[PDB]
């Protein structure tokens, strides 16, 4: 039943069949509106012209209203993991980033990119250097710790709301060993990272925020890995094509390239062994 799903997946990477099947799945769920991202006021809060959030599942700021961010909820048959999948903050949407995190009650922010891959700004540094604080509107982030190996970094922070005189604790995990070109050769450092993400998620019932640069590629990989890992614990079949379909119903284009899909498929099969 699960073993049957992993023979189909294994013969599909030999077969060459799962890359073929990947190319058929839609990128945008037909008929889902994405026309806020295209409103004159909101266009410049988007990192790419062609990565917009579905109106139907976008995260709505209490301000007004817009951030490039969607709720993604992943149900496990027979546990509904909540995420907010979002782009990496731009310089001018940093206050929006922290407004979202506060209002949705997140206590964990998973960052899947470095700030400058090749010679390009992929994400704005929206948190202060350790021992530091910085202000984003009425929110003040102060950062206590920075510990991590050559593959990932854990930052312990306090996020403080000055408008509501209150402060919550907050943990950011950043995976810093993604290659500039393509996908990792060995998934073993990434897999370890995903486990950490799960230990600290725990049985908390709030969205974990997860971003890369556009918040569709690596972000889809991370959510596809954590889903696949609970499917396995519950003895449920694992069909990577269907995990992406569920994701894509909730944010367009999750898992961007064939190579990332191949990565997630080969990762899942190595995790099952």
What range does the domain containing 173 cover?
Answer: 1-273
Whole-angstrom CA distances from 91 to 47, 68, 125, 172, 242 are 11, 14, 8, 19, 35
**Cα dihedral across residues 247, 253, 257, 258: positive or negative:** positive
User: Is 212 part of the annotated catalytic residue set?
Assistant: yes
By DSSP bridging, strand 108-111 and strand 166-175 are parallel
Structure determined via: X-ray
Helices 258-271 and 240-248: crossing angle in degrees, nearest 10, is 130
Helix, coil or strand: residue 248: helix
Chain position carrying tokens 């700021």: 61
Give the whole-angstrom CA distance, residue 183 versus residue 258.
10
* Strands in 24-124 per DSSP E: 58-60, 66-75, 80-86, 108-111, 116-117, 120-121
- Residue 269 tokens, joined: 């099969």
- Number of separate domains in the chain: 1
The CATH number of residue 20's host domain is 3.90.190.10
* Known binding-site positions for substrate: 180, 212-218, 256
Q: Nearest CA to 29 among 254, 259, 267, 270?
A: 254
Of 50, 18, 13, 67, give the one whose Cα is nearest residue 243.
Answer: 18
Find the farthest-apart pair of alpha carbons in the chain and give their distance in angstroms, rounded.
Answer: 59
Catalytic member of 143, 212, 230, 234: 212
187-225 burial, b if ≥16 CB within 10 A, otherwise e? bebbbebbeebeeebeeeeebbbbbbbbbbbbbbbbbbb
Full strand arrangement of the beta sheet holding 58-60:
58-60, 66-75, 80-86, 208-211, 108-111, 166-175, 152-161, 139-143, 133-136
Q: To which H or E segment does residue 200 belong?
A: helix 188-201
Q: Rg of the chain's alpha carbons, rounded to an integer?
A: 18
Q: Which residues does the annotation place in the binding site?
A: 180, 212-218, 256
Resolution (A): 2.5
- Strand, helix or coil for residue 141: strand
C-alpha 59/C-alpha 213 separation (Å) is 17
d(CA 40, CA 242): 35
């Amino acid at each position: 039943s699960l073993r049957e799903s992993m023979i189909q997946l294994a013969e599909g990477l030999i077969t060459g069949t799962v890359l073929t099947q990947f190319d058929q799945l839609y990128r945008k769920k037909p008929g889902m509106t994405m026309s806020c991202a295209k409103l004159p006021q909101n266009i410049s809060k988007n990192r790419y012209r062609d990565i917009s959030p579905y109106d139907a599942t976008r995260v709505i700021l209490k301000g007004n209203d817009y951030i490039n961010a969607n709720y993604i909820n992943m149900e496990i048959p027979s546990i509904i993991n909540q995420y907010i999948a979002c782009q990496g903050p731009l310089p001018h949407t940093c206050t929006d980033f922290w407004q979202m995190t506060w209002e949705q009650g997140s206590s964990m922010v998973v960052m899947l990119t470095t700030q400058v891959e090749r010679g390009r700004v992929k994400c704005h540094q929206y948190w202060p250097e350790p021992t530091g604080s910085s202000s984003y509107g009425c929110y003040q982030v102060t950062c206590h710790s920075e510990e991590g190996n050559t593959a990932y970094i854990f930052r312990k922070m306090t996020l403080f709301n000055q408008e509501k005189n209150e402060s919550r604790p907050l943990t950011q995990i950043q995976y810093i060993a993604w290659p500039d070109h393509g996908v990792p050769d060995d998934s073993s450092d990434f897999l370890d990272f995903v486990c950490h993400v799960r230990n600290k998620r725990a049985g908390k019932e709030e969205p974990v925020v997860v971003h890369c640069s556009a918040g569709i590629g690596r972000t889809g990989v991370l959510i596809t890995m954590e889903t696949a890992m609970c499917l396995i614990e519950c003895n449920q079949p694992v069909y990577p094509l269907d995990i992406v379909r569920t994701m894509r119903d909730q944010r367009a284009m999750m898992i961007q390239t064939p190579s990332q899909y191949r990565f997630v498929c080969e990762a899942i099969l190595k995790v099952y062994e």
